[PDB]
């Protein structure tokens, strides 16, 4: 009786339902999705309309919500598609599509406003006075966890330099090939931070794709100011944990659930397809750290693979109220006629 409805288990879509709940509870995104001008869209083919439909139903249905029209619209109607692409690839596919649909509309730019950060990728030559700084956008951060205790250590790893030498010297223009270091620096962190935790890796000694079930700690409140090039005293890069996407299994399948505190108040719920239940903070956070390798139960293979954080100064905008008045009447009427 949480007031949050679930999604049907309609096949082998792995992380999909977890991602859909996470995006639905990104309220500012949900509101913008409702404003997309989809009146000309073919239902079979339109990802924008299909997301409007799923969100509308998550907002209004008292029964579990189906996704078959959604998977049809983006063309992943087989397990193989979800096995070959990861959760952030699906996220990027969905977000790129709705971003394009919002161009020229009243909600243009919602996706980059919410999710896009700025970094500099730099190459510094070690023995000539030459540095190339290139600005890059990012929409998520892939964190390495093997050998890392916690998010801090993973961020340190992320910004560690790579050596360009040997057969990988840097092309420094008039200087020719040069020994160099390559790294990234964070200029901004976005309001909504998607951190993907690399829970599978290639083991170089065995040529195998292995599961990492190790303990990897993440906090409910995450300070990141020290990873920025310049901080703002009025807007520290303090992040609040919003969602924990969890996988149980040592292979690329099994059971997927998401833990959310939709309001950002630390009151957590577990979203397990059609069953949404209140849970403790430990069930959402510490129980998903990993590190139960001696344990012969499913606990050994249950851990987080993606985290969503929201910047504290942006919480009220990101999680702004969404009302029925935010859904255009024409859209409601279209979706209601389809349910028949």
């Amino acid at each position: 009786h949480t007031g949050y409805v679930g999604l049907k288990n309609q096949g082998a879509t792995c992380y999909m339902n977890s991602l859909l709940q996470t995006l639905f509870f990104t309220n500012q995104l949900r509101k913008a999705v409702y404003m997309m001008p989809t009146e000309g869209d073919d239902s079979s083919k339109s990802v924008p309309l299909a997301l409007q439909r799923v969100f509308y139903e998550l907002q209004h249905s008292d029964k579990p919500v189906g996704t078959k029209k959604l998977t049809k619209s983006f063309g992943w109607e087989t397990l193989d598609s979800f096995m070959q692409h990861d959760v952030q690839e699906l996220c990027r596919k969905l977000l790129d599509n709705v971003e394009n649909k919002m161009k020229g509309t009243c909600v243009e730019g919602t996706i980059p406003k919410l999710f896009r950060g700025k970094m500099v990728s730099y190459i510094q030559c070690k023995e000539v006075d030459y540095r190339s700084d290139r600005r890059e956008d990012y929409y998520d951060i892939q964190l390495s966890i093997k050998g890392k205790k916690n998010i801090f250590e993973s961020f340190v790893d992320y910004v560690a330099v790579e050596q360009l030498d040997g057969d990988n010297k840097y092309d420094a223009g008039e200087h020719g090939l040069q020994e160099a270091e390559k790294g990234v620096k964070f200029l901004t962190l976005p309001p909504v931070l998607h951190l993907q935790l690399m829970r599978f890796m290639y083991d170089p000694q065995t040529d195998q794709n292995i599961k990492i079930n190790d303990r990897f700690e993440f906090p409910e409140q995450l300070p990141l100011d020290e990873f920025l090039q310049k901080t703002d005293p009025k807007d520290p890069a303090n992040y609040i944990l919003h969602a924990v996407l969890v996988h149980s299994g040592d292979n690329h399948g099994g059971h997927y659930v998401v833990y959310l505190n939709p309001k950002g108040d630390g009151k957590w719920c577990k979203f397990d397809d059609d069953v949404v239940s209140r849970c403790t903070k430990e069930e959402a956070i510490e129980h998903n750290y990993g590190g139960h390798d001696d344990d012969l139960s499913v606990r050994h293979c249950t851990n987080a693979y993606m985290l969503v954080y929201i910047r504290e100064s942006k919480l009220s905008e990101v999680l702004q109220a969404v009302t029925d008045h935010d859904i255009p009447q024409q859209l409601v009427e279209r979706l209601q006629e389809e349910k028949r």
Partner: protein
């Protein structure tokens, strides 16, 4: 122009390419340099898997861009 590729072990390699190179040509160049069979290679840029028959120019991949080699089975 020179681009970078991060391999599955985290090593960054350089590659000499042209904007007109198809992605499968890039995979051939990765095989030439690193020995990785193209059939094992999956490349990501800007958060999406690159299509073998499209070009670096099609993806706006410019000098000093970094591509990522990723596992064939990475989802669920």
């Amino acid at each position: 122009m020179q681009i970078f590729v991060k391999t599955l072990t985290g090593k960054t390699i350089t590659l000499e390419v042209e904007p007109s190179d198809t992605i499968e040509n890039v995979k051939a160049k990765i095989q030439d340099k690193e020995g990785i069979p193209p059939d094992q290679q999956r490349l990501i840029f800007a958060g999406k898997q690159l299509e073998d028959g499209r070009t670096l120019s099609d993806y706006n991949i410019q000098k000093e861009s970094t591509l990522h080699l990723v596992l064939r089975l990475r989802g669920g």
